[PDB]
Structures are given as structure tokens and as C-alpha cells.
Amino acid sequence: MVQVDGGRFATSDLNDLYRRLINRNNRLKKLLAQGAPEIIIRNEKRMLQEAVDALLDNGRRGAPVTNPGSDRPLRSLTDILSGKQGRFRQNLLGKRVDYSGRSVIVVGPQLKLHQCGLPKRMALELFKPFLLKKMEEKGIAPNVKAARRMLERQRDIKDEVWDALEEVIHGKVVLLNRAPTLHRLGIQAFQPVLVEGQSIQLHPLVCEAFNADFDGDQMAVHVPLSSFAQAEARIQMLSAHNLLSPASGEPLAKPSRDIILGL
Amino acid sequence: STSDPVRQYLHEIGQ
Amino acid sequence: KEVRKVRIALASPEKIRSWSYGEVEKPETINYRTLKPERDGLFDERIFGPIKDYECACGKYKRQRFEGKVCERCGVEVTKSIVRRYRMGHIELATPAAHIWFVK
Amino acid sequence: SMARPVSIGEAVGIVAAQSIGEPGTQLTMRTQGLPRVIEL
Amino acid sequence: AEPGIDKLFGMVDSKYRLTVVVAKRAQQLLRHGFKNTVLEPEERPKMQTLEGLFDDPNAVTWAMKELLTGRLVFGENLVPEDRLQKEMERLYP
Amino acid sequence: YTGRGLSFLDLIQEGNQGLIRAVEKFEYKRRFKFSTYATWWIRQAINRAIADQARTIRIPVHMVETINKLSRTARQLQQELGREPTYEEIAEAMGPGWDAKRVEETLKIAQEPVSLETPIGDEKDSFYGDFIPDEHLPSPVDAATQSLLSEELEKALSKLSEREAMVLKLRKGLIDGREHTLEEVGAFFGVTRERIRQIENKALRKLKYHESRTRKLRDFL
Amino acid sequence: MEIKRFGRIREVIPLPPLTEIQVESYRRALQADVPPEKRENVGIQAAFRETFPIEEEGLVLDFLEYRLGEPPFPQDECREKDLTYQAPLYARLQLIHKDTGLIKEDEVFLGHIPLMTEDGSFIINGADRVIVSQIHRSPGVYFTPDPARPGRYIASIIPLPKRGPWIDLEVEPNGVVSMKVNKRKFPLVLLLRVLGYDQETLARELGAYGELVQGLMDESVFAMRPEEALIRLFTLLRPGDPPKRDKAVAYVYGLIADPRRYDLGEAGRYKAEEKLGIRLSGRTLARFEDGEFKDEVFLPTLRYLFALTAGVPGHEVDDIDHLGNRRIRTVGELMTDQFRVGLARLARGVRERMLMGSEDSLTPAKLVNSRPLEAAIREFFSRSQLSQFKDETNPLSSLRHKRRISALGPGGLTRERAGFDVRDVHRTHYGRICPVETPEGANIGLITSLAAYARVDELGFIRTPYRRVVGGVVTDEVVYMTATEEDRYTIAQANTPLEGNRIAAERVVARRKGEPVIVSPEEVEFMDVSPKQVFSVNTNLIPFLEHDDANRALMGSNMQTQAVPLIRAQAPVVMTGLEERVVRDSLAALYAEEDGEVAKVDGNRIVVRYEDGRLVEYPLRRFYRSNQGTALDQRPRVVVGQRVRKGDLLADGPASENGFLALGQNVLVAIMPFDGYNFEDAIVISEELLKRDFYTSIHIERYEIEARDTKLGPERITRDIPHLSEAALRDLDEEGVVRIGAEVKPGDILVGRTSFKGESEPTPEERLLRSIFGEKARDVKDTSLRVPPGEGGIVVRTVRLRRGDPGVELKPGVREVVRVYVAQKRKLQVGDKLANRHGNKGVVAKILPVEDMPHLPDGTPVDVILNPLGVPSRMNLGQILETHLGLAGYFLGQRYISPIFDGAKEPEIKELLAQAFEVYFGKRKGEGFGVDKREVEVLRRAEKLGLVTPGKTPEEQLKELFLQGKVVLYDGRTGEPIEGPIVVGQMFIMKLYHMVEDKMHARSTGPYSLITQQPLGGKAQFGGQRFGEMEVWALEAYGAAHTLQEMLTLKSDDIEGRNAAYEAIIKGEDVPEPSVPESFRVLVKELQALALDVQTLDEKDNPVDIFEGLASK
Amino acid sequence: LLMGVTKSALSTKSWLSAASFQNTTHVLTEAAIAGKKDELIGLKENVILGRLIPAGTGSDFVRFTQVVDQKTLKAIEEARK
DNA sequence: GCATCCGTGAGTCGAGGAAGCACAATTTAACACTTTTGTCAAG
DNA sequence: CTTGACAAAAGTGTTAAATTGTGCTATACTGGGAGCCGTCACGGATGC
Ligand SMILES: [Mg+2]
Ligand SMILES: [Zn+2]
């Protein structure tokens, strides 16, 4: 039961389901202490059973319990765990992650197969902890906290921060992801090339694997952090290392529309 | 009605 | 040690009471005026733990030095407020109620 | 993917599922097409 | 592609063993500040900076180059883990 | 009484409790029929139940009565002014002891919490809870700056004497977690209260000199 | 620049008012201007007459009349103050005492009714909204074949939505007719006996069909009295209730006979009489009068069902998707339904209030509590699925939004329960619903557009115009007819050749019930008005539409709604003819009411002296921010002293050029591959476009902040923010708000605010730090509004609302609200999306300097390079034809109007290209230049490619190429010609609303969720990217175990892991090993809340505590 | 016996992976009554707990490989033998 | 064998945030006072 | 290192408001109210 930025209170449906069970339980105790007739006691016990049922699995038996003033059923314990919006599929089998970005993709014809074009402003946020360490290592900032204040305001960013960023990413790779990820080639590791602009440059030969075109598509960006994650991405997930199809064994990074036409 | 708690209660008090 | 297996089983009333740090006896959540958790309610500090680290409800203990202590004035344990994500209560039913999973 | 003997430790089950299901949208739908595969 | 990736893949029976070896060696290099490298001064990876050429800060790059040289030994149960760290600390404080 | 926060069966059971109370107090000598006297208790029980169980955040019965009266007054004024009354009109109509500020505070008191699972958008895949940040647990940036400051303060306290560092760490709660006092600090060391104050002040002056000559600790403030 | 028009079809009638579907429906519902006595029984007047009189059974509350007052505030004020543009509604009601016979009348204020603006939208809580019309099954009696048992049919009786149950009539295999109501089946004989039907009557009426009547002549109940039958039926319908005549009759009367509970509708009643050949007195299945039930439609319905089964020639089944069986519910009808719903709730309180409390001293004002009525009305206009945030990216966007027809919404289908039948193009869609304009995706076929000439009739059925043909000569008599009426005629095609008014062709292409046929002129009865009536307004804006595949035309019409207004917008070089009417009907431009003279012209307003002498001043909407953030302003197009006739243009609105719809620029285009920058829909543009400010748009962002009353103290909007230098406060005025005209970048303060810090003892480290520096902690903290990452511009406006301001209804506890408007002028950049009208779309991938672009021999560089590989697979050849006509127009200096399916053809385009070559090449000859060496090399290749005739002169061969739309093009980098002639022309391209500036987002760390502690989602929340199930599979398939583990724990919800990981990185160390995610701990506690003992064990089966001992008692 | 992919997946020996597929109430109700113990064999169970999946670099075949240089190896062998 | 019923399932990112009063019982606030604590100058 | 004034800085103790909980109304009143409604697959279980 949390207080929102505007001072209003937001609460979960479980509190309402718990209150109903507690209210009915307390009332039954009072009725039993009063020696109420069996008809009243039977109604209270039947309501107590239904209140427990709604708490555990709302709507499974009978009409769903709704919050007065609306017809939206209250979300019970079973609803929390089940379904496409439940705990399993929404929070355990997949998650939202840090060190991730997104932008529109354009074609980079000058790139090598293992390279991508990463915008500088995306890379600045994606590699921020590494950049702060490099800023402190150099004389750009006195400490990590001073360096972080420098990056907060756009007009406070100096031209040596971009030189430091170029050093941070040297040799590292990033993961480029396009939805839907139909097969494992929907994620590939590239060595970023910091570029001016706001769109990600994608190598032409990997568009078929991503099923990507340049009509407005977008991709996500992920930064593996440890040495193990960087080693796996550079060895196993690098685009230049996955040239054949895992499904049929035929080339999957190969000449395409304009390349075929010219040759 | 077995499915309807209200109908079941009304039937019982009507006895 | 490392976790190697996960087991699932039915919980008896005795086991459910061993989990709980106290019985929730009132449907009160918080005070409409002071916004503090109500005693014996669904957000009680005497059951689920303090709302802020190493600070009881009555404001008599306010440091980690009194760690693992329970204030006698308010009854709130002086510990981390993160235990409020892990500590369970319980409701003692006047009469038994079947679990709908094992019925429907 | 490498035209060489598979290496021990590869999740061939996941690869098999992605290989089968990836071209699923290219199957005609209008006993034939994707419905035939689903029934099988 | 990574330099000498074809040769690296041919040095192990499973491609995932190469990643484990590279990832572990990179951690060793970082933990000792690259003072335990088997690479000669003229073999050390370099990065072009505004000031000038400096040692590559990427430890995964260092491990791959060292692994190609053939001066590293990898395997299972080569030495006890505790003794290995103790000796490497002594040799490269 | 349906549609006021309690379900139909909940109203019946609360009413049944008033009916049980009516049988206890009903007096047949008066020759009044049972329904005339019982209807008072049945209604009273139902109304008290609504005042006590209709809201997630319970508002006392007296405050519930004030809220109901304020709603009635606004509704009557609204139908007479041909528009929504302002707090000034409502306060004037409520009577003595009421002003625009009190009318507004009472209305702020009577705001029910919103559900964390209310859908947003035509397709039900987004909810209010998905947009509310958690501001209790420290963020990774906040945790690191706290640990960085502790490390720097530890180094700065190294330049102090063996006892001067203990004095500052004891007085500022850097050891046991809670601040100690001059007398309590003296109890540990056996020195009088006045001397502890001076030695701490000299150490604080020492640290100030070190910080000025390094300026390695001002950024954390 | 002269305009040349193509086409032979003479349209006899102009396009109807494009927004009349919204405007006319709402007028009829309100009837605000009709005198109260002349008001018809429609709209809210029918709602009042249906609920009243409210009788207690002896107080009667009667409704006499209603009236609507003037809106409290004008439309502009409502937008500024977040109000709803509405009129107060009063009802004149009289309370009559049946006992005394005394009448008291007074006018009660019922509430406020939102008012529709002139353009056909609403202002709800300060936001523009549109009520989307809903298509649903028409009420009536329908006869469909039983699928399980061939040869058997079922009769369905359908009332208005939520106005009675659906009734099913079936002939069971036993031969007994069963009536199904509310999922309960029973024999129709019982209900038929209730309606006072005898054995003899059923024999006389339904006994001439065969054995079917014999299955409806069970004498076990015929001898039963109608009263007993009603009691018998009441037991079946609701088993358990004490069978009582008063309760039994009330149930049956309220089920099929109560006009306040069952409503067949005006359309349903009309359809039933048309099908069954009867005349219904009312709109209910049966009438209850004289204390007895009278059948109205059950016997006629059964008679049709029997004869259909028997096989009489004149009876047939119903196509439920036939557009004569599907109707449209407009805003007027949708609003009236919610008015009736809330008005019934108002009556319910009246009855429960007139039976308690001062019975004699009651007045209409005391009885009536209008809160239920207002709540129903506000709910419809706020939380309804059909009440939608208005789409106003450009003038066309809003026009399209008001003509949309949705099959979803309350009372409609479900986005996942709709089959192919509801999503298909029905043959009756011709001329009524556009076959191409629809959302591609999950909503394909569920959202549609009204066709250009179509209008919804009084009953809700779409009609389209047809020209009457008599004796082989087409007359000018136009008839608007529905699909059911259209099926009776042979309708010819609009392109049918006519020699004046007589059909000249001996063979005429026509339709008979939607089937194309070839007939003679004497068999033709009607004619299409024009090809435009088959398509929507958007689709009618695509030139050369007959050359484009429908799959791309769907994209072409949808993308026109996303084009952003430009500061230098231009009307297309090739137009269809609907460009002027779209601007006229959108009400974005300004026109002269009648003849007059312009007296004052200014950037803010225009004053016109009309002939009658009255001065009218028109304020101009300047730099107004729409719902989409695009700037909408009107620019005067007249000068002081200029004479203007009635209807002349006074000022252009957004995206219009001299009254013509201008959604983009006209650019010089070359169709060729260019170094891989054209790859896969990517577009290459010249830097010359940016230099002259083509595709430059103005966008405005609104930032809001509130100062609230708090327990710790009131938040304050101030310039004195703690721990801030003068640089960060440089642009803030004394009031604490950013000055107008300042440029703001990300991280800059817009409004300064301080909030009282919560009482909390500081940590010892920070308490020493403060002691060391001798700084006392302040009681307030910085909580000001800053520019988010990736945003900024120029501050153009600041609005300040304070509590107590006239019309400012701030929330309780809110002291004031500050709104800042930031405008920015966006130029075309890499990653921006461009599109033409033929479905060709792409993002800018490369901006080249002028000297790198291909250029004509005269030195003219092209502006855009398009890949030819996008044409062959898409089959949208209309863009090639547009380019050819654009090339001719470029050199002749003219524009063209080619109507769809009746316009420019290749022979006419080639005759224009021949003229364009004379100016294009004849100019060179006079200048003293011959044929280039580089052109001669290209002409040699061309004849080997079969493009030019061998043996001709270079000039003749160059002309042969030109008539094909191809020119010799030079490479700006080398100076050498492209080895083959290239298709160069002039094309109309739009800058769409999808911009990379609004979509680039990156995050390292930020806000986290409450329960799961995982990162939030959305760029607005500074959230992370979702790593869903399919992404996890890809990492699993790669074998990246450690990469997968990081994203699951260190980067999502491992609270201790992500804290340590961040600290390790900023210290130059490697990230640590992850731990158990917090999501799994939440799962374990949730499984325990279900009474399940979930325990994590070790290799030896001993319990392992994953809660750090924090939950072990 | 022959069964479809849906029935084969739901009758798996791991309740964690079956409960996260579909029919969660049915899977959990039978697992709880039987006291089923999940051995964490497949990929879904390890992903749910945030463990290292037993595939790729997380497989026991390659997971315990060690890397060491000549100088340290000789010292360890020499310092012991 | 068999219908008929119920229950479970149906792609991925993104963007969209109506009593009223009486009275008793309990709690909160405002004094009052004494009792630490923190400084001071000395000494 | 103390050694005595000093002054807030804090705490303890009543007291009175201000808030909150609870009991009580005596003509006779005696069984609710809202859906209404265009999908298709499968098992699996029962009515037998
Ligand atoms: Mg695309
Ligand atoms: Zn306490």
C-alpha cells in the first residue's frame, strides 16, 4: 500500500481479499458467541468458505469478486502465478534488464561483418559505470561522484569524455536484438563503432538472419558485463562466427538483393 | 440455487 | 551450501503457524490520519517487521547496536526493514475451509 | 552451424525447437500447411 | 572475426571449453594487473590513443593472443585450485 | 443499502446482528409490533457496518458522518447553483467551524486508494504497478557512494592519532552504530567530560586541515 | 504554375460533408435548437419519454420538457484549464399527487452534456476526443441454417444491444419446437399458449406446411389455461422462486413485453416487418394489455421458419455479414444509450426516495438526484473504448479518425474472438466501406473506413448513391440505397462510355448482387456515380491507384495520416482532386463567409469588411500544440485591401498550400541503387534538402509540475534551490520558472521546486562529513523539473494555474500547477522515416553533400535516391507512373490532377514527356551545346539494351529515352555517366511521425519495480529493455550460460548482485558472482501464501535458507 | 505410448518447468500432494532460480577446466615433488 | 459410444502512467518541571 | 588533564483539549437484481 508521487495511495487486490476474509471470520466469531440460530451460522460459514476461495482462486467457482464501483475481478493468488501475465512467464522466464538501450536501425555498408554502428549518446549511458572509472583514471574528474555530476548536464560534457569512451569500449562487444526472436540468430554480438546520430547502423549481410529491413525497424542493445559474458559473446555469439544456418547448415550470411544484382 | 449464494439463502429463510 | 533441489508439499496448520510471526486479527491497514500501520492489522510492524531499518514503531531504538532486540513499549523488532518482504502472518479460521485447488 | 561434429554441452533441444518453429509463419494456412504440422 | 578463431576452435574438443579457458585466463590477467602474461613485450596487445600506443586494456583480447602462442596449459584437475591461487599470488604479488 | 461498499450478503449478516440485538431489548408490554422496534436495530447495524468496513483505509464513524454530510451539502448546492460549488460555498453551507481549507482537507481525507492492478490501454497487458518506482531500497548508485565515502573517511581518520580516531568514531556513531556522549565516551576511557570535548575538537580541526590540503572529501557532501 | 486535369467521368454530385457522420448524428440526439414542442421522439427526448413518468403506484413524477444552456466556458478556455466543453441540462418536471390531484412543477438541473465542436470532436478534461462509430449486427428476425443437421433452420430474434435476451427458435429432431432464452430451452407451445393461442388457430395458420405443425399441437398444455401456462413457464424460466401470478406475470412481462427492458429498436422493428411481412405496433416481442398477453412477432416468426423448412419459393436464409443486416451506431446513438442507462438509475433512486420521507411535502428537486446520470455520461466520454484520444497529427488524421468504423467496443466483438467472416470484405461493402483502408495486424478487418460517398441513414444502414438509368440513357437523378435495396437491380459501372447521356457501349459491365456480368444498355437500371465512391478519403488521395497492389495501397493510405506538417509544405505535383475538399472539410483553414474586403492582415488575426458592412475579426491559431506534439498554426494568405468572394481562402492551416492538402515536399528522385545505402528500403537524400529547409517540422513538448500540501510542509516553486550554483539557475526568473525564449538542454531546470525532507537521522559517515565541513543540513531538498534526456528546445510558453482561479478545479491538496511548453524545429536526419502515397516507406540512412549526388547533364542534382528493388516484389507501379508525370511537370512547370481509375494514361503522359523534352533539350541547343561525349557512350549501351532504335541521331535517341521517363545521369563523384539511362522524376514524399529522436533510449541503472524489484519499462520511465522468453531461448541455444545468468540476476533483480556489480565496475574490478534473484523469493512466498511448503534443498536433501535467516523465527 | 508435445511437456518429471508452461494449478496441485522434488535438470528450472544452465559453458563437461602458464605449473610441481 | 458439459489455450518487442446524537473512553497536545548534555572560561 | 558555572537539550509528569469508540432511537414495514450477447480447438469427465 504505497503513496504515489501525487500523495495518492495505491494498493494491491490481495489486501481487499484479505480484508473480506478477516471481516467474515470476525463476524462469525461474534455470531457464535451470541448463540445465533443455525440458519445465520450456516450463511456465515458459507460466506467464509467463499471468501477463502476468492483469496486463493477468484472466479474459479461462482461469480468473481470485484471491487465495488467497478466490474474488474480482483487479482487472487492463482492469477498472480498463472497466465502470460503471471509470475512465471512475466518475471521469471523473462525480465527487464539494466545496461540496455534501443533505437532505429539504418544500414551501414562500410561496416565489417563483426561491426555495428552504436550512437555515442547511447554508448555513453550504456557504458556509464565504465566511463566514470576511466574519467577518474584520467584527469577529467577527481572522483566517480564528480564524474557523474558532469554527465548529468549535457552542456557540462567535455570533449575528453568522448576520448575516454572510445577507450572504454575498445575490444568489447554488444548484443543486438530484434523482436520477434524466432531463432538464435535474432541476437548477435558486434563490436560497436561510436557514431554521430541517434540510429544504430546494421551490417547488410546480417539483415536476413534478423529478418530486418530499414522501413522503421528497431533493435535493442545489451551490454555483457563480466569477462565470462564478454568471452562468450565474442567467441560464440559474434556475427562473424555464425555464418551457417543451425537449421539446415547452409550459409545464412550471404549476398543479398543489391549485392547479387551487382555481381 | 447451488451456484447462487443469495438464492440459496432466500430459500432457507423462506422455510 | 548450494541449492540442488526444490521440493513442494502440503502445509499443515502447524507448519503454517510456524511460518507466521503473528496473527492478523483486524482488517485495518493503516491509519487514515497518521498513515502508520495499524496494530494487529494487515501491515502491523509487530508482525511483519519495521518500516525503516533499525527503528521501532515507538521510536525508542534507532540504531543497529540494538540489533535483534524487541522494543518493550511497541513490541517491534529492531532489525532491517527488508524482512517485511519475507515475514508472514496468518489468519486463524473460526471453522475449517477447504482449499479450492483440491476441490475444483 | 559450423560443419563439424557437435560439441558436448550444446542445447540441441532449444536449437531444434527454434529451427522447426522459425519458418512456421511461411507455412500456408488459408490437413495442409501449418495446421498439418500442428496436428502431427 | 576474431583473429585466429579457426586455430583456437581446433585446440579444444568442445567450443565451450575454449570460452571457459579464455574467460578464466582473462580473470587471472586482470587480477594480477597483466604482470603474469606469457606474452613478450613486443607481443603485448596495443590500443591507439590520442597520446600514443598503450597496452590494450581488454583482458579477453590478451587471453586469446596468449592461447594462440601455445605457452598456456589447460585441462581438468591440473592442480588444486587453492594451491594454484597461492602460488600465482607469490610469483606475481 | 446495496452499492455502498458492502455486498448484499454482507449487509444481511450485519443486519442479522441488529435483529439479534433487537430481540434482546424488545419489550412486548408496550404493545408495539416487533417490526416497528426491530427496524431501528437492523438499519443501525447495517449502517455501522458500512462505516466500519466499506473502505480499505478505515475512517472513524464520526469522520464518515462528516464526509456524508459534506457530500449532501455539495449535491444540494450543485443542483441549486447549476454548477459544482466551490469550497467557499460548501464551507458556508456546512455551518460554523467550517472554512474552505477544512472542506478541502476533508475531501483529501476521503480519497480511496487506487488498485495496483488497474489496466491501462485497450489491451490488458499494462497496469499501474508497472509505472510506480520503488524508492525505499537504495539504488546501486546510492549504495556505492555510501561505501566510497566510508572508505575515504576511513583513510582520512588514519592521519589522526590512535585515541583521537576512536573519540570521533565513538562520538559520531562510527563504531557501535549509535552516537555516544562525552560522559559515556569518558566512561570507556576514564577521562572527564570537558577533556573529551577539547580532544575531539582538535582532531576535527586536524581533519579540516588535511581536507583543505587534499580536497579529496568535499565532493561527497 | 498551371494545373492540367485528366479524366472523362462527369460526377453529377459533389462529395457530401465529410464529417456529417459525426455532426448530424449528434444534432439529432440533442435537438437543442428545435422547439421543445416540435421535438421528435428521438435522441435524449426519447430517453426522457421512455423512463418517465416515474410512478410509485400515489405519486407520479412526469417529464414535460428539457433544455440546454450555454456552455460555462468557451472551447479555448476548456483546453487551457483542463475542462470539459459542455452545456447544462435542465428538465422541467412536475410532481402530481394522485390522491390529492395537486401538481407542482419546477426545473431541476440534471447535469452537463458534453458539446460537439464544429469539426465534430469533443473536449473532455481539456483533451480532444473522437467517438468512433461502431458496426454491429442489426436487430431483427434472422433465419440461418443449422450446421449440425442439414436441412434444418433456426430463427433468431435479436433486440438492441443490452435491450433484451436473444431468442432462438428451432425444430428439434423430435419435431417439438424449442425456444431458448437465457441459455434455458423449453417448448414454444407453452409460451404460445400463454399468448392466448388455441389449437384451432395454430391449425388454420401454421397447418399448411406439412408435419411441422403436427409437432406444435401437443394438447397436454392446450387445454391448460393461459394463467396456468404462465405459472408453468415461470417455473421453467426460474426454478426455485415461489410461483405466484404477480411474480410470474412480472417476469414474463419484463422479459418480452416491457418497453423499458426489451427494445427491438426502430431499425429492428423495420427489419422484422420487411422480412416477416407484418406491421409491428411497437418494438417488443409481445404486448401486455387488458391483463393479458398478446403475441406480436412469435407467430409470424414461426410461420416463416416453417415455410423456409417446407421450401416455399419466397423464403430464404439471412447472410449475417450482409451489409443490409449490419448497421452503424454513431456518436448520437452511443451517447443516448448511456444517457438512457444513467437516466434509468436516476429513476431508480426517485422511486426509492418517494416511498420514504415527507410523502406529502415532496418536490421534483428533492426527489431527483442527478449524480447517477452524470456518472453514466462522464464514464462514456472518458473510459469508453469508442471514446478515443483524437488523432490530429495533420488535418487528414483527424478527418480519418471521425470516419472510422470499429467492430470492437462495448457491445461488439473481441480482438481475439473475431473469425475470418467478420474480417472479410463482403460484396455489400462496395461503395459503403473502403476495401483497402484497414489496420494491418491483429485488427485487420475489425477497423474500417466509411467510403467517400457513403452516408449512414436514420436507421443506421450505410447507403451509397447510384444514377438512375431509364431506356439506356443515364439521368442525373441520384438515389441513395442500402445493400438490401441494391440487390434488386443491375448496376452499371461509372466508366461505361456515354454519348452525351446515352450508353454508347453495346456490352456493359455491371453487377447483379455483387456478381460482375456483361449486359445490354437496355438491361441497365442504375449507374455508379464515380470510382471514388468505392474508396475512403485516404485511399482517394493516391494517384494512379489502379496500378498499385492493394497490399501496398493499404500502407499508402495509412501513412498519409502520420505525415507531420512542414514549414514549407507543398501540394503534390500529381493530385487526384480531393486535396481541396479535405482542407475545406477539416476546418483547419480559414475562408470568407461572403463577399467582402480584407481590412487588417496580421500574423495573429484577420479583419474582413463584408458587403453588409459588418466587421469580422478572425483570430489565427498560432503555434498550437496538437495531441501528437505537432505544431498547428494558421498563416494568412491575403493582403490588406484585397477583395475576397464568399468561400475564398483567408489563411492556410497545418499542412495546406493555398487551400490544397500539403503533407510533404515535391523532390527530384532517381530510381537506382546507390552504394548499398539504398539497401532494404533505406533512402539516400541530398544535403540540399536540409539547406533550403525541406522536411523541417515544428514540435512542441509540454512539461507539468505541481506544488502540493504535505504533512512535512508545502512544496514551493522557487528560484532558491539548495546546493545549486548560479549557472544552473541562470535562466530561472524570480518566480522560479524558466524564462520564455531560453534554450533548454537535457538536465536543465525548467521549474524550481523544493520539498521538505522527511525526518530521518543521517548516516554516521554523512554526519561526520557535515561536522568536518561545518555545514548544517537543510530542511528542504531539490525536487525541481528538468529536461529529460534526449529532449530540449526553446521555451515558448509557461502556464500557471493557482487554486481559486476562475474555472481551475485543482485536485485537493494541490497548491498550484506549472506547465512549460518547449518548441524545437526538427530537420530531416538519419533514421527519420519517409514515405510516398503508394506504400513505399523507408528511413534516411545517408545524407550526401550536393557534389556527391547524381546530377543531370545540365548540372541539376537529384534530391532523393530510391532503390528499384523495392518495386518488383511490391507491385506498386503507381509510383513509377507518378515519377514519369513528375518529370514532365518539372520541365513544363505545371501540376496535374489525375482521378483514380479515370486519369492520366501512358499515351497522354508520353505526349507530355515529348513537350518536356523540347524545353529540356531545346534549351540546350539554343545555348550552343550539342550532345555530350558521355551521353554518346550511354546511347551506345542503350541500343544494345533494346531501349533505343539503332540508326537514329543522338538527339532522337535521347528523346526515345525521355519518353520512357529515363535520362542520362552523371555520377557526382567520378563525373562519368551511369552506364544505363535512369528513371529520374519528381515525386511527392512525406516525413512521417516516426522519428529516431523520439525513440532512441539507453539505460544503465534507474527505477525498479515495487514487488519484483526489476527495472521499469518505457523510455518515459527511464526503463530497461524486456529480455523475454524468446530472447532467453536464443542465449540458451548459443550456450551463453554466464551471459544468461547476468541478465537474470545481476542486471534485473539480484539486489545484492546489482549493488556489488555497480561498485565493482566503478572501482575497476570484475563483476562478482550473482546470487538468487528476488523474483524467485517472491514466488516462494506466494506459493507459501497458497499453503504450499516449497523448500530448496542441498545435495544431501537438507534445507537451504535462501532468505539469509530473515524469515526463520 | 505416443503423446503430443503438449501432453508430453505437462507430464514431465520437473514440476517447476511444467508449472511455468500451462495448467499451473493442476501441475502444482499434483506436485504438492506427491511431495515432488525438482532435481533442476533442464534449462527452464535453472533459469527460474537464476542458476547457471547445464549447457554451453555451464555444462559439467567443460565447466571445471583450468588454465595455467608454464612458470606457475613448474613451481607447483617443483614446490611439491 | 456418445453426446454434453466444463476447463484451458490461443506470437514478440514498443507506446500509452445516503442519519444524528449522546456520552464514555482513548489519544494527542501543552504546559510544567527536573535531568541530562554541551560548553565554557578558567584552573 | 580537571573544575566549577552556565545554557540549552532533553525527558518526565499532569491536564485538557481533540479525537475515537459505542449504544441507542418503540406506528408498522417480512424472499435480490442484473445479464441480455458473433470462436475454435482440443482433453477429460461423467449422464448414462
Ligand atoms: Mg520493417
Ligand atoms: Zn518501540
From TrEMBL, chain B:
The chain holds residues 76 to 90 of 423 of the full protein. This is RNA polymerase sigma factor SigA. Coiled coil: none annotated. It is found in: Cytoplasm. It comes from Thermus thermophilus (strain ATCC 27634 / DSM 579 / HB8). Transmembrane segments: none annotated. The lineage of its organism: Bacteria, Thermotogati, Deinococcota, Deinococci, Thermales. Interacts transiently with the RNA polymerase catalytic core. Belongs to the sigma-70 factor family. RpoD/SigA subfamily. Sigma factors are initiation factors that promote the attachment of RNA polymerase to specific initiation sites and are then released. This sigma factor is the primary sigma factor during exponential growth.
Automatic annotation (TrEMBL), chain F:
It comes from the Bacteria. Mg(2+) 10 binds at residue 125. Residues 182-201 bind DNA. Mg(2+) 7 binds at residues 95, 98. Mg(2+) 4 binds at residues 91, 95, 98. Mg(2+) 11 binds at residues 216, 219. One of its GO terms (biological process) is DNA-templated transcription initiation. Mg(2+) 3 binds at residues 91, 95. Residues 1-56 are annotated as: Sigma-70 factor domain-2. One of its GO terms (molecular function) is sigma factor activity. Mg(2+) 8 binds at residue 98. Keywords: Cytoplasm, DNA-binding, Metal-binding, Sigma factor, Transcription, Transcription regulation. It is found in: Cytoplasm. Mg(2+) 6 binds at residue 95. One of its GO terms (cellular component) is cytoplasm. Interacts transiently with the RNA polymerase catalytic core. This is RNA polymerase sigma factor SigA. The lineage of its organism: Bacteria, Thermotogati, Deinococcota, Deinococci, Thermales. The gene is sigA. The chain holds residues 202 to 422 of 423 of the full protein.
